[PDB]
């Protein structure tokens, strides 16, 4: 694991907001997180574009299965580890990569899922503004542990561990060690 934050009773939220004059756009995305949970349904990580742009990335457990929904402008694209159960309490790591409209997802040592949606579609994830970890004010708050969060070179959980100026921690969330 990396920097571990426990998400407790009633859930919490860790929000990194990109400085206004440096809100980044991109064509390919890297997203990796280690976790351990029992939730059948929860939202772990959500990346949002600025207000007005409907562009998003969401890492979410649904039906007990980990996966990612996302839209860059055209269509809502879904990808998940369908074959196995991921809310077993054991520490898992899920890696997500997003090359344009196309994406791949892997969990632990298991076979790598590839998703390639048909029809021409946009590639740019426009002006990204906020990363939300725990998604308390989303519907399903995460309960369990999130550790070592990578989003395109950003160690977001390590940033909150050394009092980064942009991150806010509201809700039941504790640092490990």
């Amino acid at each position: 694991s990396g920097t571990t934050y426990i998400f407790s009773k009633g859930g919490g939220q860790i929000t990194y907001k990109w400085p206004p004059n440096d809100r980044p756009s991109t064509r390919a995305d890297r997203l990796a997180i280690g976790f351990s949970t029992v939730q059948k349904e929860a939202v772990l990580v959500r990346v949002d574009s600025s207000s007005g742009l409907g562009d998003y990335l969401e890492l979410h457990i649904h039906q007990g299965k980990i996966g990612v929904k996302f839209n860059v402008g055209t269509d809502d694209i879904a990808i998940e580890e369908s074959n196995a159960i991921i809310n077993d309490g054991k520490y898992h790591v899920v890696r997500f990569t997003r090359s344009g409209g196309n994406a791949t997802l892997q969990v632990d040592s298991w076979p790598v899922i590839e998703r390639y949606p048909a029809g021409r579609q946009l590639t740019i994830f426009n002006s990204q503004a906020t990363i939300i970890i725990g998604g308390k004010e989303q519907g399903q708050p995460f309960q369990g542990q999130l550790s070592g969060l990578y989003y395109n070179g950003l160690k977001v959980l390590n940033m909150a561990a050394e009092n980064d100026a942009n991150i806010a921690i509201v809700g039941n969330v504790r640092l490990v060690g």
């Binding site: 004059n21 809100r23 980044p24 756009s25 991109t26 064509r27 574009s49 600025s50 007005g52 742009l53 402008g73 946009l122 590639t123 740019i124 426009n126 002006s127 503004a129």
Partner: protein
């Protein structure tokens, strides 16, 4: 002994003492080879990495320029910069040596990894050179490294047959290869590879925007400045390259059925014969230039910017308020005006060039200042404003609207101060590409041959102010930081905030809103 060891070998340069006491030294590196000679089977092919030389390359004079035809009355006067049109004889000096092997750049290093400012020239995609632009003054003034680049022009760099036979956009690809060489090698000169800024005027301003829209350019430059230049202007992209390729082919005995043998034909023939060739498009459009290839340029620059199909780049756009002087000048009498009947005609075929009866009438109305209805001096200013708005102001504000809405720190400007010259008419406003001598800091070193106007203390103190905004932007992505100077507010479609640049520099609201939106919101869907 100005000597730098790079990836591709060791290179020697020259030390220019500036034509000013205040300003200090600049080490020049002229005719540096950034890509392999695009000749033989490499003509009409993407640029190749250049080959490593073993010794020390005597890169102290300019390199030959790319093959270009330069004749007074055979070039689109209205399209090219004004100092260019009016000074063709002096221009021709820098265009004397012409090699097909022409992919070379020039580096100006002042004497920390200094910011990198790549300058892309361009009148009509047919002619021009970075050698015209002396990135000396701008360099030691703002302590920035400046680069002026040569790329395949005319046919030799933009020929497309609409398929894989000729893909086009080679020029653009050369610019890419330039930035490739730069981000890899500029470190050896003392540059910051993560602070590279491409800037240009005219078509060279379009090229800037055209690179922002190409996935190839990713991770090669962070900021961008476009001056009197857009990817959205009618002459920014060639929409019928195969049409002209085949019309060119007929003029050199190459027009064959199969497209692949037509391309192999033209390759074999000498470069001088294709360049001297007489090929011209319906006015305000182009024969050779960037094409929609579905690879470099994935789709139309208009679609891609409404889709947000571009990375977040630090953009600074702008126009001068008398852009299309060249359109109007040729019908001005001694009393410095334009008659009512000359106004009605100009509009008419302006519609017959770019677009019927209602459009002919609306424009005619919109560009009549009913405060001074009958004065032909006023009727000149607004007829001037017509082309100014339609070709420059409208596309520029369109871009800035679509860039700020997709979260990019955009900054817009109006340049209203012209260099006082007797080369142009007295009544004149700042013409197309009149901001160049200010950007390049020419007022600092007095008049040159290429900019001969009587330079005044105000022109120098304006040029200092502009060079500040320009360098500051290349440093921080913000024209206000870090060098101290009215602060240039960030542009956004809510209040469309632009810096009105001139004798009285001021931040103003919604530049020409009521006329700009005529072209962007009323005219589009009138049919």
């Amino acid at each position: 002994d100005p000597l730098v060891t790079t990836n591709f070998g060791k290179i020697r340069g020259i030390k220019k003492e500036l034509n000013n006491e205040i300003l200090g030294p600049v080490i020049q590196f002229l005719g540096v080879p950034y890509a392999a000679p695009p000749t033989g089977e490499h003509r009409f092919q993407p640029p190749e990495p250049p080959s490593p030389w073993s010794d020390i390359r005597n890169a102290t004079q300019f390199a030959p320029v790319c093959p270009q035809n330069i004749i007074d009355g055979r070039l689109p006067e209205v399209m090219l910069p004004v100092w260019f049109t009016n000074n063709l004889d002096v221009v021709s000096s820098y265009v004397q040596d012409q090699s097909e092997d022409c992919l070379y750049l020039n580096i100006y290093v002042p004497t920390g990894p200094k910011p990198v400012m790549v300058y892309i020239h361009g009148g009509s995609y047919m002619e021009g050179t970075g050698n015209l632009y002396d990135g000396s003054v701008l360099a030691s003034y703002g302590n920035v490294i400046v680069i002026t680049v040569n790329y395949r022009l005319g046919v030799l760099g933009f020929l497309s047959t609409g398929d894989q036979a000729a893909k086009g956009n080679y020029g653009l690809l050369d610019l890419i290869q330039a930035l490739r060489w730069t981000s890899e090698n500029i470190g050896f000169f003392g540059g910051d590879p993560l602070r590279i800024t491409v800037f240009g005027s005219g078509a060279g301003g379009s090229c800037v925007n055209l690179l922002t829209l190409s996935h190839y350019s990713e991770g090669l430059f962070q900021r961008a400045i476009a001056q009197s230049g857009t990817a959205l202007s009618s002459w920014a992209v060639s929409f019928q390259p195969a049409k002209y390729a085949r019309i060119l082919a007929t003029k050199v005995g190459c027009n064959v059925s199969d497209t692949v043998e037509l391309v192999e034909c033209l390759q074999k023939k000498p470069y001088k014969e294709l360049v001297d060739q007489d090929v011209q498009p319906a006015r305000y459009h182009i024969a050779f230039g960037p094409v929609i290839d579905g690879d470099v340029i994935p789709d139309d620059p208009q679609i891609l910017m409404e889709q947000g199909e571009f990375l977040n780049y630090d953009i600074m756009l702008g126009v001068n308020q008398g852009e299309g002087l060249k359109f109007v000048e040729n019908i001005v009498d001694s009393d410095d005006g334009v008659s009512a009947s000359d106004f009605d005609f100009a509009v008419s075929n302006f519609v017959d060039n770019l677009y019927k009866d209602v459009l002919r009438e609306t424009i005619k109305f919109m560009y009549t200042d009913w405060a001074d209805r009958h004065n032909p001096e006023t009727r000149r200013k607004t007829l001037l404003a017509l082309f100014t708005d339609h070709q420059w102001v409208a596309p520029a504000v369109a871009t800035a609207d679509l860039h700020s809405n997709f979260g990019s720190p955009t900054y817009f400007y109006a340049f209203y101060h012209h260099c006082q010259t007797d080369q142009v008419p007295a009544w004149a406003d700042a013409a197309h590409g009149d901001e160049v001598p200010y950007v390049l800091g020419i007022p600092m070193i007095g008049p040159t041959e290429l900019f001969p106007c009587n330079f005044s203390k105000n022109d120098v103190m304006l040029s200092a102010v502009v060079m500040t905004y320009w360098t500051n932007f290349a440093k921080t992505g913000d024209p206000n930081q870090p060098v101290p100077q009215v602060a240039w507010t960030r542009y956004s479609q809510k209040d469309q905030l632009y810096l009105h640049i001139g004798l009285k520099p001021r931040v103003k609201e919604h530049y020409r809103a009521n006329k700009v939106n005529l072209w962007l919101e009323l005219v589009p869907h009138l049919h």
